[PDB]
Amino acid sequence: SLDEKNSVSVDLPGEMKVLVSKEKNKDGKYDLIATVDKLELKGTSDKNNGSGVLEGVKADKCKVKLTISDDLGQTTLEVFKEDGKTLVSKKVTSKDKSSTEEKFNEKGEVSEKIITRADGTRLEYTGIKSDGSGKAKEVLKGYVLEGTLTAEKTTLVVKEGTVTLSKNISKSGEVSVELNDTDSSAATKKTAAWNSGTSTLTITVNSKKTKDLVFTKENTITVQQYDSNGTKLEGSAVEITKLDEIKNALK
């Protein structure tokens, strides 16, 4: 690496660091060094903030490239095959802890994708086929929701008895929730209405509103019951912590 006397250490997204030389090199560019996964990457830049491109080659000949954004707000770490073009892996990390980590296949096509939100919640995609479809999972605090993915959107599903709950997330991040019950008895059959404006799903049974399921901006779900006659909410909303609790809300 570089000498403390000869360089400034700068922190970066994803717990990374880069050493920027104090002086410009013989070409009038600052030197850049960063060790990533035991491999030292090198680059130079006309600027001295730590932004630029660094590169290195693994023992297996794979080319590694790290791009540090101009304001140090993002890093892109790519590992290519020895041809330096076919992607093997790619991870973009933001200063806010969010990131997108993509695994590619033998032909350089993303086969898997992991999207980490700043709050730590994840959206994991695998078995990604050529037509944009694949398997999906949403990793939340306390529980995991599972579903599928298609070019249009991701759909996580939760079933309990004859009731199926589906949470849709489009590419734009738009969320919508819906519920369907195959129950025949009109006295026990669940029905629901979605209010996008408030991100809440109101369940009804036997002509009475029973519960409001709120899907928060903080990627949590809360439940609150309506009074005995089903007209107004009672008490306070309680946050879901376990998958079983969602199912209990669907019973």
Epitope: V8, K22, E23, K47, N48, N49, G50, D71, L72, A118
Partner: antibody, heavy 120, light 108 residues
Framework: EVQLQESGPSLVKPSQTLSLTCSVT????????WDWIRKFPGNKLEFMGY???????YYNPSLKSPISITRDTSKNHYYLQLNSVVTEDTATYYC??????????????WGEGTLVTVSA | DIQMSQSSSSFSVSLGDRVTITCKAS??????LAWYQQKPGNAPRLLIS???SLETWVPSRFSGSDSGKDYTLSITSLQTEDVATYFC?????????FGGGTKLEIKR
């Protein structure tokens, strides 16, 4: 893109406390450095302090009077407080975001600034 | 505190003429210097970072130099829109400190 706007009284008496607010829009204050800089009547600039990730702060040790910086991530507002001001605290106060998200850099985005006079 | 010194408080320049503004640090700051342009009734605007790296809004006539005894901000051809006060500032070591400002007046 971020927008910064300072708010506070134009007149505060010596011995009293000066409180200012910086209302930021277009970006959350949860990332980056959010500073307070003042411009003295003789056209002299002075860095006062900043608040950053997790509410961590730093204050210019050379300041005549001690200050404190806090934030409300819910409101996306951060504040400046200076107790027992003196006439020498008369200046135009500016809030600004540092250029880069890590390390030491300049002040890229500034508010319009508010003139605060400290006088009896 | 590192003292940043701009020995000239103000200059008067002719339209289209070359201008050079000087900035000195009390100690070595290794080009971790910023420059700002401030026009009356407006907040300072970051113009240069790293002593020579221009920001994207800046016209090509502006430049900064490292290769001298101290630091400078140069304008090859002064335009009417350049009449302003320029401030240098170091961010090498805390706390960041500013130069006193150099005001420009255009002749007519």
């Amino acid at each position: 893109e971020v927008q910064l706007q300072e708010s506070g009284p134009s007149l505060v008496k010596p011995s009293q406390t000066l409180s200012l607010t910086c209302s930021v829009t277009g970006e959350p204050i949860t990332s980056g450095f959010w500073d307070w800089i003042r411009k003295f009547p003789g056209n002299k600039l002075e860095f006062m302090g900043y608040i950053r990730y997790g509410g961590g702060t730093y204050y210019n040790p050379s300041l005549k009077s001690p200050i404190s910086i806090t934030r409300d991530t819910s409101k996306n507002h951060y504040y400046l407080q200076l107790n027992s001001v003196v006439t020498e605290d008369t200046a135009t106060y500016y809030c600004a975001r540092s250029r880069d998200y890590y390390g030491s850099s300049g002040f890229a985005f500034w508010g319009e600034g508010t003139l605060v006079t400290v006088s009896a | 505190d590192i003292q940043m010194s701009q020995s000239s408080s103000s200059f008067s320049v002719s339209l289209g003429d070359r201008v050079t503004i000087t900035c000195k640090a009390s100690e070595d700051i290794y080009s971790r210097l910023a420059w700002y342009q401030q026009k009356p009734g407006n907040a300072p605007r970051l113009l240069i970072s790293g002593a020579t790296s221009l920001e994207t809004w800046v016209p090509s006539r502006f430049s900064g130099s490292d290769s001298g005894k101290d630091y400078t901000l140069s304008i090859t051809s002064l335009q009417t829109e350049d009449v302003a006060t320029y401030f240098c500032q170091q961010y090498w070591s805390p706390p960041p400190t500013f130069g006193g400002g150099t005001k420009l007046e255009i002749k007519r």
